Amino acid sequence: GNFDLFVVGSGFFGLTIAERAATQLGKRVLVIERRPHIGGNAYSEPEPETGIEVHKYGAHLFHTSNKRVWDYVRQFTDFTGYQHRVFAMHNGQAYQFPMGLGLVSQFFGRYFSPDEARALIAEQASEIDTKDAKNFEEKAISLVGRPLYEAFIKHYTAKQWQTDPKDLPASNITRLPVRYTFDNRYFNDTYEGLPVEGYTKWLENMAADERIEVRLDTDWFDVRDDLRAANPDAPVVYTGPLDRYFDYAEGRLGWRTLDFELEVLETGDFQGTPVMNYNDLDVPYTRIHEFRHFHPERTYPTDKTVIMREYSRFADNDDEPYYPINTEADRAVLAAYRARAKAETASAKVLFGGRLGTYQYLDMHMAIASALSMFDNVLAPHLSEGASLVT
Amino acid sequence: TGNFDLFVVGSGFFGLTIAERAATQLGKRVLVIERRPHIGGNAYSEPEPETGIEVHKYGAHLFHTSNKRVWDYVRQFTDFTGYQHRVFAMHNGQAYQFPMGLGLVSQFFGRYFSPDEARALIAEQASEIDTKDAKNFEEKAISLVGRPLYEAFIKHYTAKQWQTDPKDLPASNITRLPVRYTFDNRYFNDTYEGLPVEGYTKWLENMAADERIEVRLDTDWFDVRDDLRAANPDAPVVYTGPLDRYFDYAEGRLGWRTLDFELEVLETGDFQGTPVMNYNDLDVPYTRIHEFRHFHPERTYPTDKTVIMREYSRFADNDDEPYYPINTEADRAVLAAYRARAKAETASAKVLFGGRLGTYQYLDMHMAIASALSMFDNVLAPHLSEGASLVT
Numbered sequence: 001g002n003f004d005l006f007v008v009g010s011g012f013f014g015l016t017i018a019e020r021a022a023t024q025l026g027k028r029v030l031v032i033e034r035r036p037h038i039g040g041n042a043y044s045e046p047e048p049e050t051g052i053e054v055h056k057y058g059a060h061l062f063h064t065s066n067k068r069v070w071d072y073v074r075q076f077t078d079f080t081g082y083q084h085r086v087f088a089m090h091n092g093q094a095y096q097f098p099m100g101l102g103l104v105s106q107f108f109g110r111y112f113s114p115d116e117a118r119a120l121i122a123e124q125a126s127e128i129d130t131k132d133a134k135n136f137e138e139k140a141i142s143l144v145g146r147p148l149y150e151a152f153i154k155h156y157t158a159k160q161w162q163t164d165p166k167d168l169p170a171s172n173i174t175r176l177p178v179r180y181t182f183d184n185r186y187f188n189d190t191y192e193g194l195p196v197e198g199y200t201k202w203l204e205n206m207a208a209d210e211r212i213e214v215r216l217d218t219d220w221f222d223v224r225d226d227l228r229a230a231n232p233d234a235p236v237v238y239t240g241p242l243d244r245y246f247d248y249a250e251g252r253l254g255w256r257t258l259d260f261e262l263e264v265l266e267t268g269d270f271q272g273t274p275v276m277n278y279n280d281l282d283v284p285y286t287r288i289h290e291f292r293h294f295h296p297e298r299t300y301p302t303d304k305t306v307i308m309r310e311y312s313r314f315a316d317n318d319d320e321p322y323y324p325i326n327t328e329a330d331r332a333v334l335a336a337y338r339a340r341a342k343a344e345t346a347s348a349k350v351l352f353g354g355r356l357g358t359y360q361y362l363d364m365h366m367a368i369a370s371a372l373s374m375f376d377n378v379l380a381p382h383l384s385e386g387a388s389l390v391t
Numbered sequence: 392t393g394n395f396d397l398f399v400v401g402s403g404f405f406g407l408t409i410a411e412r413a414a415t416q417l418g419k420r421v422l423v424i425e426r427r428p429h430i431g432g433n434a435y436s437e438p439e440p441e442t443g444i445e446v447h448k449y450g451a452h453l454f455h456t457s458n459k460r461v462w463d464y465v466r467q468f469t470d471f472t473g474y475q476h477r478v479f480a481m482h483n484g485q486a487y488q489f490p491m492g493l494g495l496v497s498q499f500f501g502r503y504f505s506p507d508e509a510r511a512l513i514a515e516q517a518s519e520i521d522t523k524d525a526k527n528f529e530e531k532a533i534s535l536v537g538r539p540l541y542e543a544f545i546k547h548y549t550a551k552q553w554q555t556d557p558k559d560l561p562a563s564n565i566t567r568l569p570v571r572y573t574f575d576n577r578y579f580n581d582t583y584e585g586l587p588v589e590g591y592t593k594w595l596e597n598m599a600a601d602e603r604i605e606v607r608l609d610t611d612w613f614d615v616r617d618d619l620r621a622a623n624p625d626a627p628v629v630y631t632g633p634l635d636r637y638f639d640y641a642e643g644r645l646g647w648r649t650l651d652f653e654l655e656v657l658e659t660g661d662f663q664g665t666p667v668m669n670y671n672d673l674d675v676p677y678t679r680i681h682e683f684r685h686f687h688p689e690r691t692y693p694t695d696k697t698v699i700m701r702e703y704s705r706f707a708d709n710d711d712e713p714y715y716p717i718n719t720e721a722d723r724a725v726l727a728a729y730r731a732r733a734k735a736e737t738a739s740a741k742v743l744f745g746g747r748l749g750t751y752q753y754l755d756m757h758m759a760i761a762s763a764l765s766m767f768d769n770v771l772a773p774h775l776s777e778g779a780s781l782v783t
């Protein structure tokens with residue numbers, strides 16, 4: 001078989017690339033996936049007992065303000081009207097979350113108006129200006145104030161990262177909306193929803209073109225030399241972990257990984273909301289997912305439910321990495337791997353993309369936007385005009 | 392102009408649904424007679440001068456429906472925003488998630504209650520009174536949600552709404568009083584909702600737009616009907632004004648509650664961070680405060696000013712606008728008498744009675760529109776198109 005393009009990894013970055021090359025240029029694409037399933041961390045599957053669709057790697061919520069991405073993804077799936085909301089469990093109480101008049105009134109024990117809340121938080125955040133903040137801890141404190149930081153941010157962050165907050169990226173906290181209204185949407189984007197027929201169906205729709213071949217249970221590094229030899233003109237888009245690609249030659253990047261405990265309970269409803277964060281040090285998990293709440297429109301049992309406890313730890317050499325940590329030390333090692341990546345692009349026509357491929361904290365919509373850009377601006381001209389990958 | 396096929400009295404959503412359907416679906420000429428200086432009844436909206444913020448001066452209007460036919464119908468006249476209504480409740484100086492659900496329950500009882508423990512808690516508290524033995528509104532409420540939640544969020548709010556001790560209100564007043572056993576605080580349960588993108592008045596004007604519809608404002612039907620009907624004798628009348636006034640209050644006066652509003656512009660960009668705040672306590676005279684900028688987040692409103700509207704409830708005296716039917720036993724008897732008079736009037740004078748005022752029934756917008764579409768399909772359109780009897 002002949003191929004015009006190799007894609008390593010079948011997550012949203014890889015499949016966006018594969019779909020674009022196949023449909024927009026008529027190219028033959030081989031997608032190589034080491035896991036037994038498609039879709040990267042966005043993969044979903046039914047829990048056998050209940051038939052409830054489970055997100056295998058914990059809740060995945062789609063949201064974007066990029067209309068071009070919204071138009072693109074709607075070609076492969078419809079979306080529900082779901083809007084994500086998260087509650088935070090702290091000292092035995094469930095709190096409205098994230099930062100907003102709900103959290104403020106609950107935590108400080110009486111109603112604060114928008115102007116009263118702004119004044120309160122300003123005093124409590126005064127040790128640092130959001131302008132000046134050098135790191136996660138400083139930025140977080142500057143936005144929500146020290147008391148709310150100590151209660152809802154500090155120990156959740158310790159569990160999720162096991163890394164000094166002063167050495168975590170400031171951009172980690174700005175993922176969360178900061179409001180002085182009673183709005184408690186977890187995201188602040190124009191479009192959001194869940195795929196009506198689930199994530200796995202969406203992903204399979206992206207790989208549906210007959211010019212796309214997907215090989216699961218296959219490690220690129222075991223098969224690449226013979227594949228490339230048989231198709232030497234084909235470039236490669238790699239979306240596996242960046243340090244692993246170069247056999248950790250420049251050091252090991254710090255990654256976090258997750259373990260899950262899935263449980264079917266003999267009640268119809270465990271927590272009354274899709275995601276409950278556990279912000280205290282006294283429980284091992286960071287949050288519990290209850291998946292029935294994502295799809296009320298489905299034929300789900302009324303006397304059973306599936307929940308999933310999420311636990312975070314360091315990615316060892318055995319594990320598969322889920323989160324880039326990006327300490328200052330990580331960033332120096334990153335700079336070395338970026339030099340290696342650019343060299344491999346020039347020498348071996350290998351492009352690097354995605355959360356793992358670029359060591360970036362990317363959501364689905366970010367990964368898809370990035371892949372659309374790579375295709376239009378870099379890969380398509382190489383594939384169809386023989387333009388250089390060295391732009 | 393003229394040569395009217397149909398008279399419609401009142402230009403609220405019920406009357407305008409009737410007029411628009413008769414005009415566009417049957418090609419009939421309609422005269423809409425409206426005693427107010429504007430169309431739309433209480434759904435009429437307008438800009439507050441100082442801020443430019445769109446307000447609903449007859450009361451806050453939130454649109455919602457679970458009927459797809461009604462949804463598809465109203466979308467011919469307006470687009471809708473993605474607004475979802477949510478309400479918060481102020482009690483003893485704290486803001487609560489509302490309606491009663493796991494959020495409120497956790498806040499009020501001082502710790503997290505799971506769906507199962509909340510269910511057990513409410514069942515235990517509700518068991519103080521058997522619902523069958525409930526002798527009034529207060530006992531029935533307690534028998535459904537338990538004494539703490541009743542006394543915190545229902546008792547005094549109800550007292551301010553009806554200006555009456557809930558002990559003196561009938562158990563009949565209460566159909567269901569659910570506590571939600573999830574954290575869902577979307578106020579309405581309906582499938583479709585949103586605010587009209589260009590506001591209610593523009594939506595209403597679009598319903599009245601067909602050239603076969605003529606509208607006469609500042610005009611009382613009873614001043615003009617005799618000569619109008621003489622000139623157009625077989626045009627039926629769809630009357631959506633007060634049922635008792637129609638018959639000169641001959642069977643008594645139907646009891647209604649009214650609302651007073653106080654509109655105020657404040658020198659802050661945001662007064663309460665949410666569209667509607669209920670005030671559950673006896674220590675403030677208003678039931679609710681509306682902040683209209685939050686009805687339309689998508690608009691560019693002033694960053695340093697806001698308009699709020701305090702709402703007050705009381706019995707509607709003779710010069711007051713009637714809002715909600717009281718429905719005492721005496722009222723229901725007065726209503727039965729007028730219902731008989733109305734049926735006789737439909738037979739002898741071809742007058743149909745409809746809408747909130749014409750039927751002594753509170754109707755939401757989508758209820759009124761659904762009711763008018765039903766009257767049209769079942770009664771008025773077969774009459775206008777085939778000469779079918781209006782008596783059913």
Ligand SMILES: Cc1cc2nc3c(=O)[nH]c(=O)nc-3n(C[C@H](O)[C@H](O)[C@H](O)COP(=O)(O)OP(=O)(O)OC[C@H]3O[C@@H](n4cnc5c(N)ncnc54)[C@H](O)[C@@H]3O)c2cc1C
Pocket residue numbers: 008009010011012013014032033034035038039040041042057058059060061062063218219220221239240241258322323353354355356362363364365367
């Ligand atoms: C716990 C977690 C929760 C998340 N929640 C959200 C959310 O709520 N909303 C949102 O928008 N995004 C969320 N994301 C991000 C999302 O899962 C993806 O990271 C995002 O879609 C980016 O996709 P990707 O293709 O870049 O990477 P990936 O999804 O990781 O796909 C990379 C693929 O490369 C494969 N691969 C790796 N090495 C090899 C190799 N040698 N050979 C062959 N194949 C290989 C991997 O098996 C993997 O399938 C979450 C991610 C994680 C880990």
Ligand SMILES: Cc1cc2nc3c(=O)[nH]c(=O)nc-3n(C[C@H](O)[C@H](O)[C@H](O)COP(=O)(O)OP(=O)(O)OC[C@H]3O[C@@H](n4cnc5c(N)ncnc54)[C@H](O)[C@@H]3O)c2cc1C
Pocket residue numbers: 400401402403404405406424425426427430431432433434449450451452453454455610611612613631632633650713714745746747748749753754755756757759
């Ligand atoms: C405070 C208040 C708040 C409301 N909030 C909501 C909400 O949040 N969501 C929702 O869906 N609905 C709400 N509604 C209901 C909404 O107003 C509906 O559009 C209305 O009930 C529709 O019924 P209608 O058209 O028959 O009533 P109306 O809107 O009252 O129309 C009746 C019309 O008949 C006119 N009229 C009366 N007598 C005469 C006469 N002799 N001659 C000529 N004209 C006459 C009246 O001036 C009026 O314009 C609210 C209603 C009120 C009063």
Ligand SMILES: O=c1ccn([C@@H]2O[C@H](COP(=O)(O)OP(=O)(O)O)[C@@H](O)[C@H]2O)c(=O)[nH]1
Pocket residue numbers: 088152153154156157160172173175176277279
């Ligand atoms: O209850 C919470 C939620 C988030 N965060 C911080 O915000 C970061 C991003 O939160 P997100 O909800 O985006 O994390 P993900 O779902 O990507 O694991 C986390 O890593 C934490 O450091 C926190 O401290 N407490």
